[PDB]
Amino acid sequence: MKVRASVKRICDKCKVIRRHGRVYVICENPKHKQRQG
Amino acid sequence: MNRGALIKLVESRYVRTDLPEFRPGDTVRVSYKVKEGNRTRIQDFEGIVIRIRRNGFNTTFTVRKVSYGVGVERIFPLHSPLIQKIDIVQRGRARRAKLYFIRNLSDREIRRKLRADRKRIDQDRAAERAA
Amino acid sequence: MIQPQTYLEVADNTGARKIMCIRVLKGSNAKYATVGDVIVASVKEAIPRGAVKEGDVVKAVVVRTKKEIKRPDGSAIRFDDNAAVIINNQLEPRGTRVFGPVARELREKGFMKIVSLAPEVL
Amino acid sequence: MRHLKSGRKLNRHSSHRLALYRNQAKSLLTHGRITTTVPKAKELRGFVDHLIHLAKRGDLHARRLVLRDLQDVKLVRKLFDEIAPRYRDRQGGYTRVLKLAERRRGDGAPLALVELVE
Amino acid sequence: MKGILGVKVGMTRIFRDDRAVPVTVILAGPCPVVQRRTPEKDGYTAVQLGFLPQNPKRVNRPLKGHFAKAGVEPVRILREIRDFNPEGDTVTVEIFKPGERVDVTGTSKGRGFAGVMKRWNFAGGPDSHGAHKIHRHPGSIGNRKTPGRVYKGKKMAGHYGAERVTVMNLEVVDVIPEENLLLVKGAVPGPNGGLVIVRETKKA
Amino acid sequence: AKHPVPKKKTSKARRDARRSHHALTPPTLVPCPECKAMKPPHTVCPECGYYAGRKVLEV
RNA sequence: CGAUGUCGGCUCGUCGCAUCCUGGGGCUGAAGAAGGUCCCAAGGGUUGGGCUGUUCGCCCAUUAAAGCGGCACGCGAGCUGGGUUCAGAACGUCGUGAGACAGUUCGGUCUCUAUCCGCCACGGGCGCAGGAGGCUUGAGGGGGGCUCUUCCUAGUACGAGAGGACCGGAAGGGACGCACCUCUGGUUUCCCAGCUGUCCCUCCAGGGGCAUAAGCUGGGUAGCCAUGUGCGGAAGGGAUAACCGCUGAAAGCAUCUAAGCGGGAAGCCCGCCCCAAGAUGAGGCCUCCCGGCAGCCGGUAAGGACCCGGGAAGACCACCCGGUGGAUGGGCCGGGGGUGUAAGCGCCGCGAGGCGUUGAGCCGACCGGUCCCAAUCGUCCGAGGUCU
Ligand SMILES: [Zn+2]
Ligand SMILES: [Zn+2]
């Protein structure tokens, strides 16, 4: 879960959600899993 | 309620009674049960009773011997079941209820300061005489 | 109750005579050391041409304590010294043969080498 | 923490406490009744009752025991001659303490007099 | 929850299984209940236990009527065992059994105006190297102008002990039915003869 | 020890406030059952010089 | 600048989290183990020492770790004074010089009384709409909270092997906190004994004072204690963080979220311990008491206080207990306990002395009994119950 401020897509599979007031870069790659913060 | 009396009662069930009365300066071999590993044998500690603190059932004593040029002071609950028995090898006539000074004396000095109790010894000879 | 700076007699034939407790390998902050305790000491006195020379820092085991020691029986044993056994890092007696009596707790802490080698276990 | 510790210090060191007791006892036997601060009297009860008890025993050994404290021949004579017999039947409580009505003017001390029992 | 009044008669070690297990001896029973704290009447569960008995000519009319509404002889001390509805009318040591875990509540020995070292184990000050008249003081007790006060609960001198104290998870070494004596491993708060309350341990 | 010193003067009301508790309780006395004279309990009535219904002091 | 004492160390801590360990988790270039990183997490802990004035740092040895900081670079009306930075002295150096240092080196006065707020304890007054005696409850408050090792699981899973698990259990630790004194150990101010000098009693003997506010020494009950022993960190419930979810539209799909629901941490609350109805919201239960001039007076009832004997209660006060029926204390007695065979006598010895008498004699607390002493005798406060 990469935490950062500039969460962004990495691959096309990088799907984004605003889950519980935060923005999550969810994808198949666990490396791509990002939490904006 | 006589609190000390009650303590007397509770300790009554655990009082060992048969052991030979002795005083400091005497030399004794203790049949003391020991639990080594799983079995439990009985090894004996023989030395001088350098001390007897008398607290009723909680009365205890200490024995002193020099094991391999090393003075081992050992203490025993006077009413422990683990004390199989007591053996008076010697009636060393001291002159004080405590005998700590022998901690710092040569063995020759020790024997010199502790002479045999002619009276108590002559009694034990006088005793040990069955019908 | 052995603590740092304490001098200990090495009760075996490693070559040392006395050692100084400089730590107590029992937790990180244990105050004292006693029977069966593994201390770390330095060689302050060794026979000439022994296995270990002075300044050697070696793990030892407390085999005798001038402070009294209780036991669940209620009995108390107490030596007229404070001795220890220079061991390896495996709780194995580095010296071949020990001197003087020792305490049975070494059995209680897996020191059967010392107990057997002990001339008189107590 | 004075837990169960018996005996007043009386604001005097050891030997002065003792010599106080001895002098007080001397005066008491010399007069039967005396006047003293209350705590001194209460500490004086046992110290006198004991000596009187040794009077009731009366042997030579008691003579030298009590004489260790009184330190007088004639006084211990009166003790073993008039004082001992009159208390031949009483077990303990050989003296009585009574508190006086007026304090001491000089410092307000509460006065109490000690007497041998009738 | 089982409990019983008791008095600390003294300590002693005894020998079970070649162990000089030290115990405190405690004259507990018999304890007659005098009033059962019921929720409808009192909003909770408990009972009221008399121990030890008191001189009839030393009891006031209110308490006397309190034992008339009860049936017990006038009794010196009276306490409540919270959450304990004994079927019986006089609790005794039989409610417990040797080997059972208990918690004891008593008043530790009053140590008066305890110094700060004896009361909180403050290190105090050195005995030499120039320590001027401060060998047992707590040193600093706060901070400078911020916040410039003393926090609540700062450890200081005061009465150490003389207070309701509860040691917990003690073991019933042995009960003594005929004597109402009970044997508990370890030590119990309070002096000999000081009243105590024996209670089942809340542990598990 | 840097010589602690009273910061301000104590007002009259505060001084009297602390002096509230300084009352001197009347020394309780009782009448002598020998001489009907007031006196403190548990002491010989110096008037009668008796105590416990019997003479001790030589008034 | 009619004074805000400056580094350092000590004591005492409190707090932040930008977390060192312990708790949880994500990803991994995570096979397992050990890791790296990041996220949540401040409950607890975060060692001893050498050097140096030092903080700092290095090092030694450990640890789970050996956190960074704030609190006037915390803390001197709490300590110190090592450094800095008074005056003296010296060195290198600059100056002609007197002198200078930020360079060094040695020495160098740290000020009894707390008024107020604050904090720690204890009280008195009044209140708590009748007065009392008890018992409680518990608003809320505080304490605590830890960690490690070993073993079985299991040498199992994983792994070529090496190595080596998860989870789940059990045992033992260290440190810390509380209590207690059975055991060990310490003090044990006159409890016992010994011994030296001096003077005295009384010549001997046997004693006493002084040698410290015990002359010294050998012991030591109680009490107080740690180094002694016992106990504790809970378990569990709830809500939860990170995180992981199930169902699922918006948005045909999918989506842990939008509706909803779940799990999920040494974290929070409770749960454990203690305080606590001044909780002025003054709580609740039980028991006891019953006139004359919202009132007012009266002695009162219950009850209490003073007084007194005390007390592991205590600075005082307070608290507890006792008060003739009483064992409350002092005696006495007995037991425990300590010291260790009293004196006197007799015997032996030229004597010093020794033997028996004799485990004697003395004996502070300790445990109980005995009313011998004394808590005598007493006085006073204290109800007539607010009204809808
Ligand atoms: Zn992606
Ligand atoms: Zn009169």
Three-state SS string over E93-141 comes to: HHHCCCCCEEEEEEECCCCCEECHHHHHCCCCCCCCCCCCCCCCCCCCC
Q: Which nucleotide is nearest to E13 (CA to C1')?
A: G182
List the beta bridge partners of residue B92.
B116
* Residues on chain E touching B6 (C-beta within 8 angstroms): 9-10, 25, 27, 179, 181
Which nucleotide has its C1' atom closest to residue E37's CA?
G285
d(CA F39, CA F27): 9
Classified as helix, coil or strand, D4 is coil
DSSP characters for B87-123?
Answer: EEEE-EE-SSSB-GGGGGS-HHHHHHHSEE-HHHHHH
The strand order across the sheet containing A34-36 reads A2-4, A34-36, A22-26, A15-19
Considering only CA atoms, which of B17, B50, B21 is closest in space to residue B120?
B21
C76 touches chain B (CB under 8 A): yes
Query: CA–C1' span, E87 to G11, in Å?
Result: 56
What is the Cα–Cα distance from E8 to E23, expressed in whole angstroms? 11
**Closest ligand by atom to F37 CA:** 2
- The resolution in Å comes to 3.5
Categorise residue A20: left if φ over 0, alpha if ψ from -120 to 50, beta otherwise: left
C1' of G50 to CA of C58 (Å): 18
Q: F39 C-alpha to center of ligand 1: Å?
A: 104
The answer to whether the beta carbons of residues F30 and F38 sit under 8 Å apart is: yes
What is the number of CB-based contacts under 8 A between chain B and chain C? 57
Residue D5 has what DSSP assignment?
Answer: -
| Nearest nt by C1' to E204 Cα | G235
Is residue E48 a contact partner of residue E65, using CB atoms and an 8 Å limit? Answer: no
Cα four-point dihedral sign F34, F40, F45, F50: positive
Q: Is the peptide bond before C106 cis (omega within 30 degrees of 0)?
A: no
Q: Contact E2/E174 with Cβ under 8 angstroms?
A: no
Tell whether B11 is within 8 A of chain E (Cβ).
Answer: yes
Q: Does C72 touch chain B (CB under 8 A)?
A: no
DSSP summary character for residue E52: S
Instruction: Tell me how far CA of residue F37 lies from CA of D113, F5, F29, F34, in angstroms.
Output: 21, 52, 9, 8
Inter-residue contact C71 to C77 (CB < 8 Å): yes
Q: CA F52, F53, F54, F59 torsion: positive or negative?
A: positive
Dihedral Cα E116, E119, E121, E127, nearest 10 deg: 40
Going by C-beta distance under 8 Å and a sequence separation of 6 or more, which residues neighbour residue E109? Answer: D3, E161, E162, E190, E191, E194
Could you list the residues of A known to form a binding site for Zn(2+), using ranges: 11, 14, 27, 32
Q: How many CA atoms lie within 13 A of A21 on its CB side?
A: 0
Any idea what the Cα angle at residue B108 is, between residues B64 and B28, rounded to 5°? 30
Closest chain E residue to B13, measured at CA: E14
Does residue B81 belong to the interface with chain E, where contact is any CB pair within 8 Å? yes
Q: Looking at strand G, which nucleotides approach a protein CB closer than 7 A?
A: 5, 10-14, 25-28, 30, 38-40, 46-49, 60-66, 71-81, 110-124, 132-138, 142-143, 148, 173-185, 189-190, 201-202, 206-211, 213-215, 218-220, 222-225, 227-235, 242-244, 254-258, 271-275, 284-289, 302-304, 306-315, 321-323, 325-327, 330-333, 335-344, 355-357, 359, 361-370, 372-379
Q: Which residue of C has its CA nearest to B43?
A: C122
Determine the Cα–Cα distance for residues C5 and C42; give it in Å rounded to an integer: 10
Interchain proximity D101–F43, CB inside 8 Å: yes
In sequence order, which residues have a C-beta less than 8 Å from that of residue D112 and are 6 or more positions away?
D35, D36, D37, D38, D41, D97, D98, D99, D100
3-state SS, residue D30: helix
Q: How many CA atoms lie within 13 A of D2 on its CB side?
A: 4
Report whether B48 contacts B114 (CB < 8 A). yes
Query: Quick one: how far is CA A27 from the chain centroid?
Result: 7
Edge to edge, the sheet with strand B71-77 lists: B83-90, B27-34, B41-53, B60-66, B71-77, C76-78, C69-70
d(C-alpha D93, C-alpha D116), whole Å: 9
Residues 6 or more apart whose CB falls under 8 angstroms from that of B71 comprise B64, B65, B103, C79, C80
In the numeric block, which tokens belong to residue C28? 């990180």
Nearest residue by alpha-carbon distance to C1' of G63: C28
Contact call for B36 and C79, based on CB within 8 A: no
Task: Report the nucleotide nearest the CA of residue C59, measured to C1'.
Answer: G61
Handedness of CA B101, B107, B109, B114 (dihedral sign): positive
Report CA(D40)–C1'(G383) in Å, whole number: 46
Ligand nearest to the CA of A34: 1
Neighbours of D104 (CB within 10 A): 12
CA angle E148, E150, E151 (to 5 degrees): 120
> Structure tokens of A26?
């969810």
DSSP conformation class of E41: H
CA of E145 to C1' of G14 (A): 14
Chain E contacts to C (CB-CB under 8 A): 13, 15, 18-20
**At D32, is the secondary structure helix, strand, or coil?**
coil
Dihedral class, residue D114 (left if φ above 0, else alpha if ψ from -120 to 50, else beta):
beta
Asked if B89 and B28 touch (Cβ cutoff 8 Å), the reply is yes
Question: How many angstroms separate the CA atoms of E196 and E62, rounded?
Answer: 25
Reported as half-sphere exposure (CB side, CA atoms, 13 A), residue C102 has a value of: 31
User: Tell me, in Å, how far CA of E165 is from C1' of G145?
Assistant: 19
**Ligand 2 center from residue D83 Cα (angstroms):** 30
Chain E residues touching D3 at Cβ < 8 A = 109, 191
Beta-carbon separation of B79 and E15 below 8 A: yes
| Residue D95 near residue D118, CB atoms below 8 Å | no
Residue A35 Cα, ligand 1 centroid: separation in angstroms? 13
In the block, residue with structure tokens 């799983």: B38
Q: Would you call the peptide bond into C93 cis, given omega within 30 degrees of 0 as the criterion?
A: no
E2 CA from G236 C1′ (Å): 21
Q: D75: helix, coil or strand? A: helix
- State the burial class of residue B24 (Cβ atoms within 10 Å of its Cβ: 0-12, 13-18, 19+): buried
Query: Which experiment gave this structure?
Result: cryo-EM
B129 has a chain E CB within 8 A of its CB: no
Say if CB B29 and CB B84 are below 8 A apart.
Answer: no
d(CA E184, CA E170): 6
Length F1 CA → G5 C1' (Å): 14
Are B10 and E20 in contact (CB < 8 Å)? no
Pairing of strands C83-86, C7-10: parallel
Q: Where are the domains of chain D?
A: 14-118
Q: Do the chains contact at D99 and F57, CB–CB below 8 Å?
A: no
Separation between Cα atoms, residue E67 and residue C92, nearest integer Å: 73
Amino acid at E162: A
**How many angstroms separate the CA atoms of D68 and D71, rounded?**
6
Do the chains contact at E18 and B33, CB–CB below 8 Å? Answer: yes
Residue type, D41: A
D113:F43 CB<8 A: no
Q: Which fold has domain D14-118?
A: 50s Ribosomal Protein L17; Chain: A, (3.90.1030)
- CA angle, residues B117, B121, B122, in degrees to nearest 5: 115
From the list D97, D118, D106, the residue with the least C-alpha distance to D35 is D97
- E with A: touching (≥3 Cβ pairs within 8 Å): no
Closest-approaching ligand to the CA atom of A30: 1
* C59 closest CA partner among C94, C34, C30, C31: C94
> Which residues of chain C make contact with E18, given a CB cutoff of 8 A?
72-73
Q: Cα(E87)–Cα(C81) distance, rounded to whole angstroms? A: 61
Beta carbons within 8 Å of E52's beta carbon, 6+ residues apart: B1, E7, E75, E76, E77
Q: Strand C76-78 vs strand C69-70: parallel, antiparallel, or unpaired?
A: antiparallel
Encoded tokens for B24: 């400091």
